[PDB]
Amino acid sequence: MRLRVDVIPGEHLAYPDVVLVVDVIRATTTAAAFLEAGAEALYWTPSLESALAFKDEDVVLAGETGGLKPPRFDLGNSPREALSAQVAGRVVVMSTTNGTKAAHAAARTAKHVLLASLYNAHAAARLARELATEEVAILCAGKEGRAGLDDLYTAGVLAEYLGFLGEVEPEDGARVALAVKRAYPDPLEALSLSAAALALKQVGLEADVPFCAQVAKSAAVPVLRGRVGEALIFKRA
Amino acid sequence: MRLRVDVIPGEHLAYPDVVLVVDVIRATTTAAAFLEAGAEALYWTPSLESALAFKDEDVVLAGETGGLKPPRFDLGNSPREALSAQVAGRVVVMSTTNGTKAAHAAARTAKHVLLASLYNAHAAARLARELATEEVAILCAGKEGRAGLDDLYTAGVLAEYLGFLGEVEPEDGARVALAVKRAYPDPLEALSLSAAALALKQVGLEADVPFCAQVAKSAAVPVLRGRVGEALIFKRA
Ligand SMILES: [Ca+2]
Numbered sequence: 095m096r097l098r099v100d101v102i103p104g105e106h107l108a109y110p111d112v113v114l115v116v117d118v119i120r121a122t123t124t125a126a127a128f129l130e131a132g133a134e135a136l137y138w139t140p141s142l143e144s145a146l147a148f149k150d151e152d153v154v155l156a157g158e159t160g161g162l163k164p165p166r167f168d169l170g171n172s173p174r175e176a177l178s179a180q181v182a183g184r185v186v187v188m189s190t191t192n193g194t195k196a197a198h199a200a201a202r203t204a205k206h207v208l209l210a211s212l213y214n215a216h217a218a219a220r221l222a223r224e225l226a227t228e229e230v231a232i233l234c235a236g237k238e239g240r241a242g243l244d245d246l247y248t249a250g251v252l253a254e255y256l257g258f259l260g261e262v263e264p265e266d267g268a269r270v271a272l273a274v275k276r277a278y279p280d281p282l283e284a285l286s287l288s289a290a291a292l293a294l295k296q297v298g299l300e301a302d303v304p305f306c307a308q309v310a311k312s313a314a315v316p317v318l319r320g321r322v323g324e325a326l327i328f329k330r331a
Numbered sequence: 332m333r334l335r336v337d338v339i340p341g342e343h344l345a346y347p348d349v350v351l352v353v354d355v356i357r358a359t360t361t362a363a364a365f366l367e368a369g370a371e372a373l374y375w376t377p378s379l380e381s382a383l384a385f386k387d388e389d390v391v392l393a394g395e396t397g398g399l400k401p402p403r404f405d406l407g408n409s410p411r412e413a414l415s416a417q418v419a420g421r422v423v424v425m426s427t428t429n430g431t432k433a434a435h436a437a438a439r440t441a442k443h444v445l446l447a448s449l450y451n452a453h454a455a456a457r458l459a460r461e462l463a464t465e466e467v468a469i470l471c472a473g474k475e476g477r478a479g480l481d482d483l484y485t486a487g488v489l490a491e492y493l494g495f496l497g498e499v500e501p502e503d504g505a506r507v508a509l510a511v512k513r514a515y516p517d518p519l520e521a522l523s524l525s526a527a528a529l530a531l532k533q534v535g536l537e538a539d540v541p542f543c544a545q546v547a548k549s550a551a552v553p554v555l556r557g558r559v560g561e562a563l564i565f566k567r568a
């Protein structure tokens with residue numbers, strides 16, 4: 095079973111089998127939290143305006159620009175606020191920056207697209223292995239072409255767990271991700287040292303970092319199951 | 332001093348101060364070997380075609396596509412062959428797949444561009460610290476949008492040495508590079524597990540890997556000093 099980590103997305107990159115998309119602070123952690131709270135589905139849109147379009151339907155609008163909730167949205171991108179929100183049985187539309195680009199990119203060629211985080215890591219890894227036939231790839235969203243220490247650490251936790259579950263053939267990115275995991279046995283340390291955590295502290299949202307540093311506290315795995323208009327439709331596996 | 336590592340190049344990425352460009356297997360190692368052999372200058376172009384335009388009496392053309400010497404070139408990209416080449420006092424023109432383009436990307440904005448490898452690591456790190464005033468960035472060439480374990484290990488060796496010289500404030504990429512260095516006590520293991528080493532084995536050029544794994548065997552540091560047409564002009568510092 096090949097094990098691959100792409101440290102940043104690339105328009106030209108292709109995925110032959112499974113792809114675990116990671117934006118641990120915060121988009122993919124928030125996505126899992128909404129499904130853990132019972133949301134019927136998550137619609138990930140490619141832009142703020144595209145999410146604003148559902149603003150009339152029976153949905154909850156969640157998202158951020160610069161990490162902060164847009165004035166017309168119901169919720170921001172905090173996974174803590176997502177987990178406690180009244181969304182059971184509801185469709186949540188999410189508009190986030192780095193995370194949606196990565197998912198739309200992987201969705202271009204992958205057979206399966208899963209949204210992974212430290213929060214749902216063991217369940218996400220187990221489903222990836224169950225669905226894979228030749229490769230489990232992990233795509234780290236990073237930020238604007240530069241890799242994130244937090245996403246790579248998460249990819250290292252996933253890579254290590256996948257190795258615990260069965261044999262794996264890693265390539266370079268996966269060896270890099272495992273090295274990042276080995277260097278930070280503490281998930282909260284790896285995440286708190288990251289640029290994404292500092293960005294949240296600069297806008298007063300650092301309380302979200304410990305939530306994102308939780309490991310395997312949810313079995314909710316968003317899986318790409320369809321598309322409507324510009325939205326990718328994720329459902330709980 | 333800020334310490335930055337970009338795990339892969341990006342067209343829009345900018346560098347405010349010093350950049351150490353790394354393509355350890357093999358372009359930046361080969362660059363240093365040519366200067367160790369006495370070459371007067373290295374002209375790095377961004378394509379085979381542009382390198383060929385510099386053909387002239389006593390000019391040596393070196394390079395590769397798919398790791399192999401192109402038909403019209405004098406030498407390929409082996410650092411062993413570069414070190415033993417008849418290049419004393421001559422201009423060596425090079426075009427390679429990853430490294431020479433990465434240098435052009437950094438040179439668009441950097442104040443200083445140095446070509447770094449394990450082979451000249453300590454001299455390169457010392458020169459970067461001497462020239463820097465606000466930041467030393469290390470640009471890993473990788474391969475076609477994906478990070479290389481070998482370039483990141485090399486960046487970690489450089490990052491560690493820069494830290495011996497004074498205060499460093501690392502960002503995410505630099506912490507990833509240092510984690511890769513810590514994960515591999517033997518530079519030959521990081522390099523021989525890398526996709527770049529396996530790609531050389533596919534075409535029978537793997538004898539160059541041990542050469543690339545030498546640490547601080549040369550004091551020759553190619554430093555950017557000019558540009559003529561499509562060639563970046565590097566001289567021995
Ligand atoms: Ca992020």
Ligand SMILES: [Ca+2]
Pocket residue numbers: 354355356357358429472473479527
């Ligand atoms: Ca290379």
Ligand SMILES: [Ca+2]
Pocket residue numbers: 560561
């Ligand atoms: Ca030109």
